[PDB]
Every structure is written in C-alpha cells, then in structure tokens.
Amino acid sequence: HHMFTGSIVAIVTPMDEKGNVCRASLKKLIDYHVASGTSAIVSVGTTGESATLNHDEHADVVMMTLDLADGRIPVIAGTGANATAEAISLTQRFNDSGIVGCLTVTPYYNRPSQEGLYQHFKAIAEHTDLPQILYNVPSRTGCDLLPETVGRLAKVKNIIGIXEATGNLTRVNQIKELVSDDFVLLSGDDASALDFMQLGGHGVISVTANVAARDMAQMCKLAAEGHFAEARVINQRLMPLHNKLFVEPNPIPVKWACKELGLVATDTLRLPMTPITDSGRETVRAALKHAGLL
Template sequence: MFTGSIVALITPMDAKGNICRTSLKKLVDYHVASGTAALVSVGTTGESATLSHNEHVDVVKMTLELADGRIPVIAGTGANATSEAISLTQCFSDSGVAGCLTVVPYYNRPTQEGIYQHFKAIAQSTDLPQILYNVPSRTGCDMQPETVGRLAQLENIVGVKEASGDLTRVSRIQALTADDFILLSGNDDSALDFMRLGGHGVISVTANVAARDMAQMCKLAAAGDIAGAQAINQRLMPLHINLFIEPNPSPVKWACEKLGLAATGGLRLPMMPLTDTGRQVVLSAMTHAGLL
C-alpha cells in the first residue's frame, strides 16, 4: 500500500469553497478503477492549509467512507506545531487509515534536532505507520538524510516522501536505513529516475488526472521495464511540469474539472483560479498526454 503510484488527492470544492462530496466520490471511484495504490487525503495538494481542523478530519473520514475498503487511505496529519500534529494524528487512531503522512514543520524552521524530536513525539503518540515528508521549497527547512536515518530507527516510522528534488538522497537515505524502509518521490518530473535509483514509488499530483498511466508507469519501473516506463513518462512530462505552472493545486483542480472528475475547480483564498494563460498551457499538456 505504500509503494507504486499514490495520489496526492485534491479536496474538491464548489465555487464557494464548500467541500463537494459528490465530486470526492467520483475521484475515489476513478482511482479505484485506475489501479492507484493508495490515496493521500488532505496533504498539501488537498489544501490542508486552508481547511479548519474539523474540516481536515471530516474530509479524511469522508474519503475513508467513500473508499469503503477498496483502496488504502493515508491521512495527511502535518502541522508546524508538534501538539497540533499529534492531535490530528490521534483523531485517526481507530478510523481505518493505513497510515499518516506528516510534513516537516513549516515556517518556524527548526534545527535537525528539532525535526527529530517533532517526529519522534508524533510517532510515540500513536501506533499508526508514519511517513515523513520533506519538501523544503514549501517548508523553508530541509530534513537531512542523517535525520531520516535516526527517525527510521523508530518502529512505526516506515518511510519518507522526499521532495527536495535531489536524487542523491535516494542512495544516501538507503545507506542509513533498513532494507524495508520505503522511499517515495514527491516530484512527478523525476519520479521515474527516483525509482530507477531504488525508490519504491511516488506520491503524485499528476495521478489526479492520469491515474492509470501513473500506476502503469510505476508497475513497469518496479518490474525493470524501464523503456516501457520511460515511454509513458515522456508523454506525461508536460503535465508533470505544467501542473505547477501556477501554485498547486490550482492547475490540477482545473484539469480535474476539465475531465469531469470534479464539478468545479473551486479553491479557497489565498489560492486563485488558474489564469487563462495557465489554462492554455495545461490544456496543451493534457492533450500531449492523451487525456483529451
């Protein structure tokens, strides 16, 4: 459940920013049918930053309900206050989630020791499997491989989503962790290279709109069919890049609306709808990928 193509699922909203259950059901069904390995509910792409604590919990539990055991659900439980991250994590103790994805604390820029103590405190507060998430471009703080290695010694810290863009991290983390520690890419544009170096999969934004292709690419890569995986990856590369032409998740939400996977591309301030220029670029990438 923690390998292959895992989608960083959008949180569908109507034009007023209200969460849309109907669209969420359509998205969950789409991923079940497409072979997606698992759903990450209310991660960064799920707009965790603009949901209230109660909404955050409600969306994860709604996703679990709609999944109905057909596909594993991983709860996004990150926060820059350790106490809040623990509180969110404990909300899912008996919920049925497969595990939690927890981001490096953002804004307050802790030391490596602070990062270690943050994740240690969370892990010790729960029996749920924990996946670390390093994305320095968003958090302003880069969790080093040595810190990952220390954290990997804790029993229920089972993997890391590495989104620094530094592919040398794969071998560096492998050298510091056990063979069963899971390495997931957080960058669609380099996910295949990440897997070729020994990674186990990707937590993907592109999978929101190209779920079957991403699942197949990961399966081929895991089977050693790099040529087959590369053919898919090249077709998807404009999507990998241009779904970030404006701040995530604005482009991917518009793409989901365009494909009929969501009723609208609704967002909450300060996020803004995709511009006309951005729409043309994303439309071209979708066409190149064979989605239209």
C-alpha cells in the first residue's frame, strides 16, 4: 500500500512502422517516467493496446518493460481476459517475473453476473501470489463491477485495490466504506481523477501521465497532502488534455502526442486503431500547448 498510489502511467506500447514493439522508444519513455516522478508503470493495459497483442507479445512487452526499468520504477502487468482460464494462464506467465502486481479488467463482451465477476477474480487471485488490482470500465466491457461485489473480493488476500474508470465519483466512498483502509482506490478516468482523489482516492492510473508525467506526479502529490486548490491549478492546465486524449479512441491521440513531444519514434498503432485525423492533431496540439508542453 504505497507503490500502488500516486501517479501511475498506463504506458503506451510504442511501435515501429510494422506495428512491433520499439525497444528504443520504450526505453525513452521509461527513463522519462523515472525522471518525472511517476510512481509505477502499468504495462500492456488498455492504453498499451492489450486488445491487439497476442499473449506472447503481451508477455514480451512486459518483460521488456521490466528489463528497461531495471528496478528503478515498479511495473504492474495488465493481465485481464474475459475467459477465467485464460486470465489465470496470462497471470501465471508473470509469477516471479519481477512485476509488483497485476491490473485485471472485468470480463468484456460476455457480460457475466456479479457472482460471475466474483468467481472470476477469486479464481485468478488463487493462482498467484501477486497483488491484484481490479479494473472496472463499463463503457468498454459492457459490464459494471459494483461496490458490493468489490467489497466481497477485497476480502481476498491478494486483491488489493481497484482502478475505477466509470467516471462516477459516488463509487469512491461506496467502495471505501465496504473495504479495509489498505485497499487502494485508483481513478481510471483522467478528467475526474483529482475529484476522485479529493473524495479519498489514493491515486490514478493515468493516460495523461504519458505526456505530462511530471505535472501528473506533482498533482497527485499535492492531492495526497490535502493541497487541493494547488492541485487544481495543475489540473486546470491539464484538463484540455484529459479530454482531448479521448477525442479519438485511446491510445490514438496519446501516441500522437508522444511522437509530437519526441518521446517515441512513430505513433503507429494496430488495426482496428487508425491514424489520428487532421482535426485530432490540431485538437491535441492545442491541448499540449495549453499544458505548456508544446
């Protein structure tokens, strides 16, 4: 309950022109996060294009990320799967890998019940020693993991927290009153992450931190200390970026922002992600400028 707080980047998976992971650029990003104060790196989350890496590529990107990090910054592996046997199998790949934990999303597309969610996350945690951070994002999955079910799973030993990406701020204290104090509450919605922290959230798993890592680390530090008017100044500088980094499907805008700041060699993605549009480039550039990054 400290490395899973603060500003945690959901790091993009930088690719070359063929759509394969670019170690050189990945190394650049990781050095940037070590130097910026990022608390940890979620490797192959949604923003890392988990949807279009097969599980072998997924494991490889994580291991590459661990190697480049070289102990300087903790790495959390994205391990979600909508089939419980496959989530178990992906998780087991990382046992004794060096990752400090997992981010495991509610099963998508097949829309299980709350009882199905509970059985899913329990079975996964029973097959590993790693801390588990639950991840709820109904807008992507078709499925809402509710506070009561969260409270049930938080009783599991190595289920330690949740990346709450509904953007519904009432969930913060709904979950918190049902879980112990060391259960970590993490925003998955950049635009409302400060609010989320002002209500008691412990940090954010952030897309914006890919291109404003220092700002995001300072904002989360101020929030944790109770300096919310001061945190709010930074948030207002970053807010157009919190919004426009989703003006087209994530991570299309944030990869283009990364390329624009020099952080990666190419903004290539894998289909069905498509190159950013002309209007999107103008919109994201204006938000980067608004942030004082460009």
